[PDB]
Design a protein around this nucleic acid. Structure first.
Lengths: 374, 374
RNA sequence: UUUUUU
RNA sequence: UUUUUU
RNA sequence: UUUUUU
């Protein structure tokens, strides 16, 4: 019959799209750890280099609380700001944060101790705790500094332009690790290898401030296992896609790597799109099977409806990412892999063997490709 | 099925075009090095020749700060201005700059020292620093001067018209190096060879003021690794495409070389356009594969939407350049190369062998071409 | 009534 | 749940 | 990421 099929499609579409909710939903007000973020009123470049080393060590430290690592990351990714108050008021949106502003006047010389402002609210004890924290690197980190070349922490900085080189090499390493932070981990990544090669050859990444592979993996894990940091990263990426061609050097790098971050972890979805709705002959083989096809169509409507942040799924780990799973269309997925295994050799390195991979439809993908070619 | 394919196309288009943001986006206010640019109130041609040699040496110097090289380049490319204040207020737009105007009254005779104005704010110490900086050429630069013929720095200039010849030969060499500054480097470039031959034979380039190959490579690198300079270059090119046929000699040369600068580094994109959407028979072979085709169509919409500056991608290194990468359509790219390898012998010198180059589709390009011909 | 998979 | 490439 | 030609 026919009208049954039409009602079937309309039902699929509605049941998928109904998970939209309201965009301005203020979720339940849960427990939120108090975070202390460091703000520097006037642009003291030596203070900022000190703070960058401070926070990189905090994050690299092992005996640090999660709120400590979060204050560290939110201060670190917010150092290039001119007026840092109104740039931390950007993370202020995030519901899972109750940050308090720490008005830093400087560092006690030669040591990691802090020098608070007058209006700021700080006691010496927490300062000493921070100090004893800021020097606790794991034993695998060689030479007691996160960088590969130990002298870098010792290099003095009083000119804004050198601090900018240092800060930006640091942050580009950070974002490059964020790229595969939720997906590929505990593994030396050829992908991050190549992204680092590219950003060196582009002169944005300076081997003068390269970080050791283990410190890279460490900051990757440390940013993954926090959330307010990733909400702030998404705030930043959505600012960096809002600027025109005229931009800072920072936001430019931000967007350049965001072009790699976006659409993270939805690989099976997009590969199915590519090797079934891209190759003009897939319904030529899978024409009977409209369930998966309307499934995918619903998924695309959902994607576009989700908003601009739809690309930051695996980053924000919002619930919706479960939808696009390849379980919702295993036959078309098996065919898409059976195609990609011959229309690409690079894809043969994908974890495409799934529990629900149809063997015969993968075989049909293979044979269709080999007939297209042979 | 069909409606799946239609939704697929619409989704591709939207996901590509949504990266537009807002044209007037004022990015995050990051750290910006203070730049001192030299302004000459009244048209003193001897002062301007002195300043041109001053800045060319500064840029060629090795022990100079980045803010120094930036002040140098922004003064150099802004010497032909009549009222230099309101021509530096053009670079004033750029967010990554906080330039301060240096009201120069002249040079102390026989030396590189500067003579400030009354209202200007300058101390002797920075003047001496500038002086000791302005004479620090690398050892590979022969004869202690950037030019090939040493006497040129010694040639006195009091008449505007000679200063103009010198200045403009300098600047045309600069722009010719800018042409392949982000793309092809650390290599003697036959392209810059031919552009220099052309601009000599056109009488715009004067072998009297030719610069040595190594000094060329040096200024190329020095302009690449700065950004505010490239934002100012783009300001200039967008002024030079706004004048009619009636123009100065300067802006005319500017635009003439901009016709080579524009659409920089997007070569794979345009070659795919040329050898797949140019040759009227490519869908004749690749008709099934509509994914890449709608991909390209989205790319073109994005290009046109980006604005007039869309041609200055690799120059401005704005984030968007990542989009047009040949990774987003490897099969059509392999076919386009398999075609261009027979419909052109010049293209055989392109770095077309990519990791994701399909061998069989390159082979199909080759065979289709050889059947068209044979 | 329920019962596989994600 | 994730996993190739840019 | 880039890479031929004008």
């Amino acid at each position: 019959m026919s009208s049954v099929l039409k009602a079937f499609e309309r039902f699929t579409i509605e049941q998928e799209l109904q998970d939209r909710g309201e965009e301005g939903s203020i979720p339940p007000e849960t427990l939120k750890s108090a975070v202390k973020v460091f703000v520097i009123n006037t642009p003291n470049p030596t203070t900022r280099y000190q703070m960058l080393n401070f926070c990189l060590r905090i994050i690299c430290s092992q005996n640090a609380r999660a709120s400590h690592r979060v204050g560290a990351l939110i201060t670190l990714f917010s150092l290039p700001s001119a007026g840092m108050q109104n740039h931390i008021r950007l993370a202020d949106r995030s519901p899972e944060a109750q940050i308090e502003r720490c008005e830093i006047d400087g560092f006690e010389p030669g040591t990691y101790r802090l020098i608070p402002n007058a209006r700021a609210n700080l006691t010496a004890n927490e300062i000493a705790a921070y100090a004893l924290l800021a020097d606790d690197l794991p034993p695998t980190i060689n030479n007691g500094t996160p960088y590969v070349h130990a002298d870098v922490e010792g290099q003095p900085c009083d000119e804004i332009e050198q601090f900018l080189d240092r800060c930006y090499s640091v942050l580009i390493q950070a974002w490059v690790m964020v790229c595969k932070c939720m997906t590929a981990y505990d593994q030396p990544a050829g992908s991050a290898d190549r992204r680092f090669a590219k950003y060196q050859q582009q002169g944005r990444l300076e081997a003068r401030y390269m970080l050791q592979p283990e410190a890279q993996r460490l900051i990757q894990t440390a940013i993954r296992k926090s959330l307010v940091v990733r909400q702030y990263l998404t705030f930043e990426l959505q600012l960096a896609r809002r600027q025109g061609l005229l931009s800072n050097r920072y936001y430019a790098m931000v967007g350049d790597i965001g072009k790699y971050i976006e659409n993270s972890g939805l690989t099976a979805f997009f590969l199915t799109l590519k090797y079934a709705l891209g190759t003009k002959w897939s319904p030529l083989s899978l024409a009977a099977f409209t369930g998966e096809l309307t499934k995918l169509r619903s998924l695309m409507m959902l994607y576009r409806g989700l908003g601009e942040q739809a690309r930051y799924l695996a980053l924000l780990e919002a619930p919706q990412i479960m939808d696009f799973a390849p379980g919702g269309y295993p036959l078309i997925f098996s065919y898409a892999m059976g195609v990609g295994t011959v229309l690409d050799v690079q894809m043969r390195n994908y974890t495409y063997a799934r529990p629900f991979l149809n063997g015969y439809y993968f075989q049909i993908g293979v044979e269709t490709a080999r007939r297209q070619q042979g």
